Amino acid sequence: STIMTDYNPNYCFAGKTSSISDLKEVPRKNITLIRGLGHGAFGEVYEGQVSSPLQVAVKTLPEVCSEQDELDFLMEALIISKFNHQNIVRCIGVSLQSLPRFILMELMAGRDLKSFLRETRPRPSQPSSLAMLDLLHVARDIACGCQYLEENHFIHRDIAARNCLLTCPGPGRVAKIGDFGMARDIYRAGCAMLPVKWMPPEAFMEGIFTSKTDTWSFGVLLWEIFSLGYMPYPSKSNQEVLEFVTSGGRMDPPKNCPGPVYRIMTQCWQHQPEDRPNFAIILERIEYCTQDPDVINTALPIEY
Numbered sequence: 001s002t003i004m005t006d007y008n009p010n011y012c013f014a015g016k017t018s019s020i021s022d023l024k025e026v027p028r029k030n031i032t033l034i035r036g037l038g039h040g041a042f043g044e045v046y047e048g049q050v051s052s053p054l055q056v057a058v059k060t061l062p063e064v065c066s067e068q069d070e071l072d073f074l075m076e077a078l079i080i081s082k083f084n085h086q087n088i089v090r091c092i093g094v095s096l097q098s099l100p101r102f103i104l105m106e107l108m109a110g111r112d113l114k115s116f117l118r119e120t121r122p123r124p125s126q127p128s129s130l131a132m133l134d135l136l137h138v139a140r141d142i143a144c145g146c147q148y149l150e151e152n153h154f155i156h157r158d159i160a161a162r163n164c165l166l167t168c169p170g171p172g173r174v175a176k177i178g179d180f181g182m183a184r185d186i187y188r189a190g191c192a193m194l195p196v197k198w199m200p201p202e203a204f205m206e207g208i209f210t211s212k213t214d215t216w217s218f219g220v221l222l223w224e225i226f227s228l229g230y231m232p233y234p235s236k237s238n239q240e241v242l243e244f245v246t247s248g249g250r251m252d253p254p255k256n257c258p259g260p261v262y263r264i265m266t267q268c269w270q271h272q273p274e275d276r277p278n279f280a281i282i283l284e285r286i287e288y289c290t291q292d293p294d295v296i297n298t299a300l301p302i303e304y
């Protein structure tokens with residue numbers, strides 16, 4: 001591990017330092033790959049087992065990779081390993097002393113939130129598959145994770161449905177923040193890869209990131225949730241969104257979205273960061289919506 005060894009990056013979370021030394025190295029002989037889950041931008045993801053063996057998701061580092069790719073992978077390992085919260089995916093450990101290198105994560109049987117929403121959309125095949133309360137529970141779960149990050153001074157920078165996972169498809173599902181790749185890239189120090197549709201004006205104009213960055217992104221996630229997994233700003237390109245948002249344009253409510261839920265989105269999208277709610281206030285507003293019969297009795301649209 002010459003690149004990881006020679007540099008040995010520090011990682012600082014909640015004012016505690018950690019290094020490669022602190023990662024739980026799992027012996028490679030204890031790790032079995034079961035199936036491919038596809039690939040991200042870089043590296044494959046597998047279902048695997050560690051040892052009633054632990055069910056894991058295995059993120060792999062390609063053996064053909066840059067010095068920068070190696071440190072990026074190490075940083076991702078340190079970031080996820082240092083979190084302790086019910087709404088952030090657990091890291092079981094790593095296997096960095098064998099090739100390809102592995103990060104071992106909690107297997108989230110519900111898969112990514114974006115896929116979950118698109119595939120669990122109410123249909124004639126399943127009329128009451130999902131209700132307004134299920135969506136408010138997903139929103140609460142991710143807001144709880146976001147509140148944990150906020151109170152530990154960690155800025156996620158890409159709160160989006162694509163970066164969230166579900167413990168299971170059925171009732172009792174818990175949503176968690178599952179990917180920290182954007183946070184990893186900045187810690188390490190083009191525009192067509194920036195998640196501009198999730199970014200407030202000060203982020204894409206000035207490169208200014210605060211916890212009010214995540215508040216804005218959470219508003220967009222709420223839209224993704226209540227739309228049942230539509231792409232934000234339907235039919236707009238990245239530059240069209242940049243111009244629309246920087247000129248005060250905001251998304252319309254999703255189909256059948258209750259007013260109280262839409263109002264949480266519109267507060268998340270205040271132009272000035274100081275006018276946006278912190279995650280404690282977002283959680284309170286989500287909790288009030290879950291109490292309101294006129295919210296939770298609202299029918300979701302049935303896709304034909």
Ligand SMILES: CCn1nc(Cl)c2c1-c1cnc(N)c(c1)O[C@H](C)c1cc(F)ccc1-c1nn(C)cc1C2
Nearest residue numbers: 037038039045057105106107108111112163178179
């Ligand atoms: C039931 C397995 N499964 N199936 C699907 Cl689809 C997915 C998962 C799965 C389950 N758990 C975990 N931890 C997991 C994946 O982690 C990865 C790194 C991840 C993390 C994320 F925040 C978002 C997406 C993915 C992901 N990437 N790819 C290629 C697929 C998936 C989803």
